[PDB]
Amino acid sequence: TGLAADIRWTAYGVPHIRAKDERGLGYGIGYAYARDNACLLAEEIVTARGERARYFGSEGKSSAELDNLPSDIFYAWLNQPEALQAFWQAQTPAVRQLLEGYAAGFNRFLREADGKTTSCLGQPWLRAIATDDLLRLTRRLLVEGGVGQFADALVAAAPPGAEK
Amino acid sequence: SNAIAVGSERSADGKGMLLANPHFPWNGAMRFYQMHLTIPGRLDVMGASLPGLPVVNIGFSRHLAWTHTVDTSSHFTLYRLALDPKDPRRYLVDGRSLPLEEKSVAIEVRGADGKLSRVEHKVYQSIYGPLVVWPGKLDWNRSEAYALRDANLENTRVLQQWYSINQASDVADLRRRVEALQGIPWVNTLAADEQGNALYMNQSVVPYLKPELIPACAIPQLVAEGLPALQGQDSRCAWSRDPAAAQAGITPAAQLPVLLRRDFVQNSNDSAWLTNPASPLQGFSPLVSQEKPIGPRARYALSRLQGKQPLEAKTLEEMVTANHVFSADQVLPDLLRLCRDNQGEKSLARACAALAQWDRGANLDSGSGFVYFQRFMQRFAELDGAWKEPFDAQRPLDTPQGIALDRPQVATQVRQALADAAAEVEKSGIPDGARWGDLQVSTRGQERIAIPGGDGHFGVYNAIQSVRKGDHLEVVGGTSYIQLVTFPEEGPKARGLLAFSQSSDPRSPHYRDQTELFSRQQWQTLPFSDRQIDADPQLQRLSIRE
Numbered sequence: 083t084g085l086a087a088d089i090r091w092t093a094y095g096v097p098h099i100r101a102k103d104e105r106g107l108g109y110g111i112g113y114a115y116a117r118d119n120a121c122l123l124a125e126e127i128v129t130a131r132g133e134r135a136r137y138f139g140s141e142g143k144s145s146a147e148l149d150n151l152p153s154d155i156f157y158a159w160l161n162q163p164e165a166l167q168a169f170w171q172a173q174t175p176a177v178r179q180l181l182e183g184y185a186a187g188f189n190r191f192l193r194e195a196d197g198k199t200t201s202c203l204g205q206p207w208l209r210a211i212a213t214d215d216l217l218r219l220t221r222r223l224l225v226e227g228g229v230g231q232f233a234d235a236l237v238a239a240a241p242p243g244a245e246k
Numbered sequence: 247s248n249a250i251a252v253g254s255e256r257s258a259d260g261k262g263m264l265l266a267n268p269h270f271p272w273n274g275a276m277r278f279y280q281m282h283l284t285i286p287g288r289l290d291v292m293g294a295s296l297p298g299l300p301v302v303n304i305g306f307s308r309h310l311a312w313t314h315t316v317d318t319s320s321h322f323t324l325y326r327l328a329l330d331p332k333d334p335r336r337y338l339v340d341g342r343s344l345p346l347e348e349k350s351v352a353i354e355v356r357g358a359d360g361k362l363s364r365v366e367h368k369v370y371q372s373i374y375g376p377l378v379v380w381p382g383k384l385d386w387n388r389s390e391a392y393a394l395r396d397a398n399l400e401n402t403r404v405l406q407q408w409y410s411i412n413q414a415s416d417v418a419d420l421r422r423r424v425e426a427l428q429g430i431p432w433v434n435t436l437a438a439d440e441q442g443n444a445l446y447m448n449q450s451v452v453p454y455l456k457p458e459l460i461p462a463c464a465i466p467q468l469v470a471e472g473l474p475a476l477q478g479q480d481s482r483c484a485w486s487r488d489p490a491a492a493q494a495g496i497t498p499a500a501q502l503p504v505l506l507r508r509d510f511v512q513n514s515n516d517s518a519w520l521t522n523p524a525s526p527l528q529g530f531s532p533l534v535s536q537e538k539p540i541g542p543r544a545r546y547a548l549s550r551l552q553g554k555q556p557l558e559a560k561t562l563e564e565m566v567t568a569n570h571v572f573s574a575d576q577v578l579p580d581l582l583r584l585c586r587d588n589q590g591e592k593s594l595a596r597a598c599a600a601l602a603q604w605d606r607g608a609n610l611d612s613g614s615g616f617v618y619f620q621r622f623m624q625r626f627a628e629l630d631g632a633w634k635e636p637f638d639a640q641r642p643l644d645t646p647q648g649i650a651l652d653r654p655q656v657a658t659q660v661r662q663a664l665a666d667a668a669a670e671v672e673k674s675g676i677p678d679g680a681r682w683g684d685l686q687v688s689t690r691g692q693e694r695i696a697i698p699g700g701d702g703h704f705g706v707y708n709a710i711q712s713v714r715k716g717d718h719l720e721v722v723g724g725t726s727y728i729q730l731v732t733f734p735e736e737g738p739k740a741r742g743l744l745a746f747s748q749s750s751d752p753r754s755p756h757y758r759d760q761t762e763l764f765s766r767q768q769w770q771t772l773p774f775s776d777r778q779i780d781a782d783p784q785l786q787r788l789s790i791r792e
Contacts, residue, residue: 083792085791085792086789086790086791087789087790087791088787088788088789089787089788089789089790090779090785090786090787091784091785091786091787092773092779092782092784092785093770093773093782093784094280094744094747094748094756094759094760094770095748095749095754095755095756095759096280096281096282096748096772096773097280097281097282098281098282098284098292098779099281099282099283099284100284100285100286101284101285102285102286103285104285104300107283107285107289107300108300109790109791109792110790111281111283111300112300113790114281115279115281115297118279118748118749118750118751118754118756119277119279119297119749119750119751120751121750121751122273122274122277122297122750122751123297123298126274126275126297126298127298129275130275132351132353133354135353135354135355135356135365136353136354136355136356136362137356138356139355139356139357139358140355145271145273145274145275146274146275151353151355151365154353155351155353155367155369158351158352158353159349159351159369159376162351168402169402172402172403173402173405173406174406176406176409177405177406177409180300180301180405180409181300181405183300184298184300186792187790190790190792197753198753199749199751199753199754199755200751200753201751201752201753215298216298216299216300219275219297219298219299220298220299220404220405222275223275223276223296223299223404223431224398224399224401224404224431225396225398225399226276226431226432227316227321227322227398227431227432228321228322228394228396228397228398228399228432229322229375229376229394229396229399232378232394235378235379235380235384235394236369236376236377236378236394237367238378238379238381239369239370239376239377239378239379239386239391240368240370240379240386241334241335241370241386242334242386242387242388
């Protein structure tokens with residue numbers, strides 16, 4: 083609670099969010115974003131949670147074109163509870179507030195969505211998000227210049243057997 | 247990505263100007279989204295952001311505009327492990343055998359029967375990080391394995407960093423804010439302010455090794471291939487700890503390239519070196535910046551930016567919308583001569599006619615010459631010593647140039663490459679009458695929209711990557727959020743587009759509206775002031791609370 087935003091949209095659906103604080107600002111951002119891109123964010127959160135195989139099976143890929151199971155292994159490894167917790171604890175109050183607002187605003191849109199701009203209405207993976215889900219996305223982006231480029235390679239790493 | 251910042255010495259109005267042309271995916275977790283954020287009295291910033299982030303990533307404010315490009319610095323290091331000769335699950339550091347740690351993860355998998363099964367997977371870890379395998383190059387055998395230390399795993403400052411950039415007043419303030427926090431993970435930053443300062447910063451999170459350690463700590467053969475790889479069997483090859491760095495093991499801000507000028511700075515994903523050739527950036531760690539030959543996008547930009555001519559917003563806009571295939575200028579004159587030398591060669595007739603007729607562009611109405619050129623260049627890139635003038639470090643802007651047709655073996659191989667390219671084009675299912683815009687498209691529902699631009703590797707400033715799907719080339723990434731910002735007296739004037747439109751959802755009114763405009767190359771105002779916002783006939787407002 084204590085979440086309020088004023089949103090103006092101009093041509094092409096560009097939102098202009100006004101708020102008195104970070105929580106309110108994030109509230110407006112998450113709401114506006116969800117109106118345009120709820121399905122996209124839901125899908126990418128499934129990826130960052132390592133739950134692609136759970137919803138979509140082993141034959142599918144992520145939007146990064148990684149196989150679902152290897153992608154899941156990589157993100158489960160990356161976004162372990164301890165890693166998320168440590169990341170959260172290192173955040174400034176202002177950033178924590180932006181993230182709390184964003185989750186709440188996205189979720190507000192989901193509660194009122196009737197399919198007008200949401201093609202994945204009714205899918206089990208379109209669901210309320212948590213600040214931890216936003217941390218999962220942030221950490222996924224963070225490693226895009228590093229270990230994320232080696233996701234398949236990490237999954238493939240096994241000790242040698244008895245071979246000559 | 248491309249970025250150009252222009253300062254008071256070159257801009258038409260004597261104030262700062264910034265062109266932002268990031269090249270990013272058209273779908274997924276790195277799909278840009280436009281927004282303007284205001285906390286009245288302390289924050290007022292507009293630009294584009296990445297999915298899930300409550301901050302503006304590339305943007306502008308009252309006196310400042312900034313953007314990013316992917317840099318050439320290392321943001322991780324591989325470590326080659328020397329395995330315990332008695333146990334391939336142990337590795338040696340200073341001759342001492344250490345055990346790998348095992349972390350198991352469990353994943354649920356939906357089966358053919360619709361039920362979930364649990365899959366467990368073991369991730370092996372060293373003191374450096376997890377082990378990685380590239381079969382046939384980075385193996386895990388009985389002698390060696392490879393681990394990967396990612397510098398951004400410890401970068402908890404990334405969100406605070408963009409929020410801080412969002413609050414920056416001018417170029418000087420932006421620099422202080424970035425150098426203070428060192429939260430930028432893997433991009434350059436370029437900026438211009440109202441006062442006419444142009445700034446380039448290679449200020450990101452980069453593994454630090456003291457200079458004297460590099461020659462012995464590198465894996466020479468992998469580093470020569472552009473992989474940051476270090477010796478994992480020597481404790482002295484641990485990242486160096488300098489107390490001035492914001493994070494243990496990363497390069498202090500003072501040791502990273504910065505260039506502050508009043509004429510221009512540019513970057514198109516090459517190193518810091520030739521940001522502005524009048525003041526080269528040299529002497530940095532190989533993990534940071536190297537004097538490598540620039541790609542054709544930067545070579546193009548510099549050919550347009552060098553000198554004393556005024557730079558107008560129109561100049562920068564047209565560098566994007568021209569769709570000039572700049573790689574053609576190094577080879578097409580000689581390719582056309584080769585064609586004329588071979589007018590009696592039937593296997594070349596269609597290719598040569600297309601190449602001669604071609605406008606050297608990647609415009610919607612550019613002819614099939616561009617397709618023949620692309621297939622030719624793919625083969626040309628594989629030939630040895632075919633350049634008339636190879637790359638000259640003394641002439642880093644004008645070389646390589648030309649085809650060495652005066653060498654008989656080159657003439658033979660070049661003609662063969664053209665014949666093979668022609669065969670490939672004619673083997674596809676496209677008539678020679680079809681133009682580039684008939685081929686390269688972005689699908690929207692059951693419809694397709696023609697998309698101008700071409701691959702950055704061919705020197706098209708408006709870089710567009712596409713993949714074969716059905717009968718067309720489907721756009722997957724490239725020019726995305728475009729922002730061109732100037733600073734007239736009334737407030738910042740921003741112009742551009744989001745090429746793939748605000749919404750990824752086919753149901754949205756904003757699924758294809760800007761994509762139609764991108765097709766026609768018709769950039770628009772990005773309204774920022776209350777006056778501009780209130781003047782928009784499409785203005786809608788909603789206030790929400792809980």
